Amino acid sequence: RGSTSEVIEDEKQFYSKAKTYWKQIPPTVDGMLGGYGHISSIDINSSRKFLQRFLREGPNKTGTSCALDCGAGIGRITKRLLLPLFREVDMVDITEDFLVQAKTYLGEEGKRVRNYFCCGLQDFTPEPDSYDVIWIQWVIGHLTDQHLAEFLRRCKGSLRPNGIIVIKDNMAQEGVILDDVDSSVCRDLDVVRRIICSAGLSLLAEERQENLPDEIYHVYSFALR
Amino acid sequence: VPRGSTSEVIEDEKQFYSKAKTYWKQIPPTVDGMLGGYGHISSIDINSSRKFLQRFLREGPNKTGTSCALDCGAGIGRITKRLLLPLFREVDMVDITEDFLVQAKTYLGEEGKRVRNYFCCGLQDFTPEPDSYDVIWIQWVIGHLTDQHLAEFLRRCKGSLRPNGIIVIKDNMAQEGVILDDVDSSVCRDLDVVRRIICSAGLSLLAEERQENLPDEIYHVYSFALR
Numbered sequence: 001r002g003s004t005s006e007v008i009e010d011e012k013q014f015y016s017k018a019k020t021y022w023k024q025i026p027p028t029v030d031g032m033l034g035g036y037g038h039i040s041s042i043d044i045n046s047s048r049k050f051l052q053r054f055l056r057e058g059p060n061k062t063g064t065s066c067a068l069d070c071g072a073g074i075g076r077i078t079k080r081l082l083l084p085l086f087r088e089v090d091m092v093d094i095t096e097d098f099l100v101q102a103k104t105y106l107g108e109e110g111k112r113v114r115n116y117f118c119c120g121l122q123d124f125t126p127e128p129d130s131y132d133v134i135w136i137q138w139v140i141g142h143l144t145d146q147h148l149a150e151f152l153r154r155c156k157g158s159l160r161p162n163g164i165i166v167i168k169d170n171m172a173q174e175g176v177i178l179d180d181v182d183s184s185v186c187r188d189l190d191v192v193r194r195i196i197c198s199a200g201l202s203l204l205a206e207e208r209q210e211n212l213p214d215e216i217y218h219v220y221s222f223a224l225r
Numbered sequence: 226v227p228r229g230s231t232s233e234v235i236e237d238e239k240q241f242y243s244k245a246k247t248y249w250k251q252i253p254p255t256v257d258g259m260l261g262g263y264g265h266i267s268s269i270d271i272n273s274s275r276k277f278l279q280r281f282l283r284e285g286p287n288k289t290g291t292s293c294a295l296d297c298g299a300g301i302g303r304i305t306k307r308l309l310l311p312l313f314r315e316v317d318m319v320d321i322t323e324d325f326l327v328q329a330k331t332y333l334g335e336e337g338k339r340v341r342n343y344f345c346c347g348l349q350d351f352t353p354e355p356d357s358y359d360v361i362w363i364q365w366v367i368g369h370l371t372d373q374h375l376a377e378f379l380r381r382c383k384g385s386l387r388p389n390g391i392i393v394i395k396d397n398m399a400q401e402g403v404i405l406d407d408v409d410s411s412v413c414r415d416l417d418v419v420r421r422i423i424c425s426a427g428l429s430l431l432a433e434e435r436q437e438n439l440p441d442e443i444y445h446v447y448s449f450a451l452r
């Protein structure tokens with residue numbers, strides 16, 4: 001199958017089952033990463049190198065005043081990637097108890113989290129002209145093709161000048177594959193690039209994550225604006 | 226050959242129980258502690274348990290009630306919080322580790338106000354009140370009882386069931402025999418042994434189901450619904 005419309009039988013249930021699944025996940029790094037908490041550092045260190053080139057290389061350098069963490073969970077990325085690099089961070093996640101745990105997990109530096117938004121991305125509108133970086137990691141599989149394109153268009157309008165959107169997520173070898181366990185899909189590169197294009201975004205950089213276990217989906221980062 | 230009963234693998238019953246009590250006393254009161262480092266599989270487990278259980282809550286001549294459940298070996302209340310409290314008006318918990326029951330008060334949150342009794346007792350010494358529970362949930366703790374104590378506990382659970390009540394066992398199953406884990410001081414039994422014990426307790430199987438989507442390296446997990 002080549003689209004979510006071909007693999008999702010019931011859209012209302014696709015979303016309701018996903019919300020149920022994460023409501024039942026322990027609010028921990030290993031819970032966020034499906035038992036691969038031990039590779040969080042490998043992930044974060046690679047993301048930081050990917051991101052830092054946009055924050056330090058001009059002309060038209062990306063700014064560091066505010067970032068948005070989408071599907072942020074308990075704040076694994078907010079804690080170790082975003083808060084050290086941005087003066088303020090907003091978080092949005094559908095699971096309220098993860099945002100509650102984030103207040104504890106993030107500690108003293110979490111005081112610089114400006115907004116905690118409890119909302120599904122498909123229902124979320126980031127404020128216009130607000131974010132230098134919008135980070136979307138391991139959650140795009142929870143939106144339909146159409147809702148993903150529409151959300152990315154809203155994100156584009158929330159970027160400050162020189163801002164970027166970063167997508168980091170699992171990529172399927174071919175087609176669009178439904179995971180009936182957590183109620184998410186995985187898409188191949190051509191599908192994702194097509195959705196990015198439909199949202200009016202340009203691809204600035206693309207990089208495959210190295211040093212991951214051989215058994216898991218390949219992971220790619222895309223920088224967009 | 227393969228061993229067929231705990232009386233072939235347990236050298237000293239008093240020490241089998243005392244070692245287990247000491248082991249759990251030093252486990253963190255967290256979902257990852259409850260699940261032996263596999264905390265991330267909790268939602269897979271809860272979704273399967275709910276689908277398994279809801280079959281028996283359907284309207285009909287044998288419909289299981291929703292007034293009260295008992296969570297056996299409940300730990301901090303992972304199952305009470307995610308599975309049982311949403312479906313039953315009240316829930317009782319029983320566990321040998323006091324500080325898990327203390328932590329439960331925090332872990333369960335506002336809905337924890339509907340937890341009625343917190344029993345701090347080994348299952349082998351616990352006698353639930355007759356005619357009190359619609360569902361008795363026994364998950365990942367049967368390996369901590371001897372064959373004789375498990376059969377007897379199931380007999381006492383049978384007496385505590387309301388009309389149309391059920392007992393659910395969900396636990397690790399060995400491919401063959403009875404295998405001792407001398408770290409946490411528990412056994413893992415094969416399906417034939419477990420079925421033998423269930424039958425000796427005067428219980429019968431309504432349903433039996435293997436748990437899907439688990440990591441390949443761990444013991445297989447089965448659910449049994451009993452009355």
Ligand SMILES: Nc1ncnc2c1ncn2[C@@H]1O[C@H](CSCC[C@H](N)C(=O)O)[C@@H](O)[C@H]1O
Pocket residue numbers: 018019022032033070071072073074075076077092093094095098119120121122137138139142143
């Ligand atoms: N429709 C949706 N909208 C917003 N968040 C969603 C969502 N569906 C699932 N989620 C959230 O997406 C997260 C996936 S786990 C990944 C967590 C985080 N991005 C990290 O890398 O550490 C969970 O926190 C879950 O609550």
Ligand SMILES: Nc1ncnc2c1ncn2[C@@H]1O[C@H](CSCC[C@H](N)C(=O)O)[C@@H](O)[C@H]1O
Pocket residue numbers: 245249258259260297298299300301302303304319320321322325346347348349364365366369370
């Ligand atoms: N003899 C015994 N009687 C009652 N509880 C016991 C016991 N031996 C061990 N336990 C308890 O059994 C639990 C095993 S961990 C499983 C916890 C819970 N059933 C869940 O699935 O989330 C621990 O909480 C431990 O304290």
